[PDB]
Amino acid sequence: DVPVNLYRPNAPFIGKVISNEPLVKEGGIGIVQHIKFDLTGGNLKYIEGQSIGIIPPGVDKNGKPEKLRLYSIASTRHGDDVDDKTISLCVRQLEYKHPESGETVYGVCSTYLTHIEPGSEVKITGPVGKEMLLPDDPEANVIMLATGTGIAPMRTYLWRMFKDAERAANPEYQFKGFSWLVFGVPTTPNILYKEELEEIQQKYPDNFRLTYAISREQKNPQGGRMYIQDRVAEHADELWQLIKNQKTHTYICGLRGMEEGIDAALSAAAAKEGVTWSDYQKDLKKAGRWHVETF
Ligand SMILES: Cc1cc2nc3c(=O)[nH]c(=O)nc-3n(C[C@H](O)[C@H](O)[C@H](O)COP(=O)(O)OP(=O)(O)OC[C@H]3O[C@@H](n4cnc5c(N)ncnc54)[C@H](O)[C@@H]3O)c2cc1C
Numbered sequence: 001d002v003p004v005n006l007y008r009p010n011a012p013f014i015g016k017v018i019s020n021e022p023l024v025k026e027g028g029i030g031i032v033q034h035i036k037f038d039l040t041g042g043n044l045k046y047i048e049g050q051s052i053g054i055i056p057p058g059v060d061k062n063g064k065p066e067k068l069r070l071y072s073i074a075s076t077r078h079g080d081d082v083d084d085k086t087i088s089l090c091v092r093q094l095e096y097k098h099p100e101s102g103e104t105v106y107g108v109c110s111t112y113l114t115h116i117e118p119g120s121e122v123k124i125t126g127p128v129g130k131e132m133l134l135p136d137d138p139e140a141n142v143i144m145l146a147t148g149t150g151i152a153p154m155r156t157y158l159w160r161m162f163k164d165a166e167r168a169a170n171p172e173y174q175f176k177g178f179s180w181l182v183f184g185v186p187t188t189p190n191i192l193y194k195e196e197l198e199e200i201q202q203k204y205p206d207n208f209r210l211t212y213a214i215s216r217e218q219k220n221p222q223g224g225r226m227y228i229q230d231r232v233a234e235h236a237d238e239l240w241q242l243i244k245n246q247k248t249h250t251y252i253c254g255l256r257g258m259e260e261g262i263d264a265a266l267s268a269a270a271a272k273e274g275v276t277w278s279d280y281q282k283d284l285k286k287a288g289r290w291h292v293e294t295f
Pocket of ligand 1: 051069070071072073090091092093094096097099100106107108109110149150152293295
């Protein structure tokens with residue numbers, strides 16, 4: 001049912017870049033690009049919450065061909081133009097410290113992607129993943145906890161739930177539950193898809209709540225920079241109350257590091273009702289209602 005591995009690294013799909021557009025506004029930190037690829041001429045199909053591989057050109061330091069890197073799909077199954085002809089990624093250029101030979105170091109696949117020109121051919125594999133899938137139940141509640149490019153699967157969910165053209169294209173999924181995105185980035189310019197996310201909340205105030213953790217602009221009650229775990233702590237009781245619903249699904253995506261604080265917050269909330277969160281969570285995971293993709 002769920003499409004997987006329609007293309008594999010040994011014979012990847014050769015897609016063409018359609019567009020490569022910046023998502024970080026001026027005054028933001030780093031580079032994050034929205035890259036749309038043409039799928040025509042191949043049979044790559046995918047659904048929300050899946051990933052694809054990109055095989056960058058060139059050899060590694062040892063002279064071996066570069067292997068694929070996985071990227072969360074950022075578009076619904078229909079693509080950004082709701083035409084079933086494209087796929088989009090949300091790619092941060094990896095950039096880091098002196099402590100790794102030279103000065104600034106640039107990630108191979110992410111630099112390739114963020115600097116790629118429209119018209120260029122790209123080697124695409126996949127799709128991959130069954131752990132971040134959205135329920136077909138239109139009355140499900142969906143909690144989304146994202147940092148940085150972790151927004152990508154959330155965008156696929158929210159566009160499917162809330163975009164006019166998606167609703168028109170998906171007769172069987174007219175979302176009427178409650179979705180809550182807690183999104184952590186360093187700056188307001190770094191709020192990926194800010195305008196569209198805010199448009200959704202304005203349009204669907206009873207079906208979508210948008211919460212930001214903006215680390216360079218907000219402080220947690222301890223005086224530290226605000227991160228998503230601080231927002232989870234702040235709204236722990238409400239989040240736990242929602243999680244108790246048989247139809248609630250939670251999705252976590254982004255760089256590793258926040259799950260521990262998220263667990264501590266939810267544990268304190270659940271303990272008030274004599275529930276051990278770690279146990280409840282194990283059962284949620286088994287039932288397919290606790291979805292984590294951290295990298
Ligand atoms: C399921 C999944 C989904 C993903 N989705 C996305 C996505 O949507 N968007 C996105 O941008 N990325 C995503 N990634 C990460 C992506 O796959 C790549 O790992 C990332 O883009 C960097 O790859 P690269 O080739 O540019 O860097 P590489 O050239 O492969 O370098 C990576 C290496 O650099 C070193 N390194 C990395 N960070 C540091 C640091 N801070 N300090 C010191 N050394 C460091 C580590 O040794 C690491 O092995 C996802 C990963 C997975 C597994």
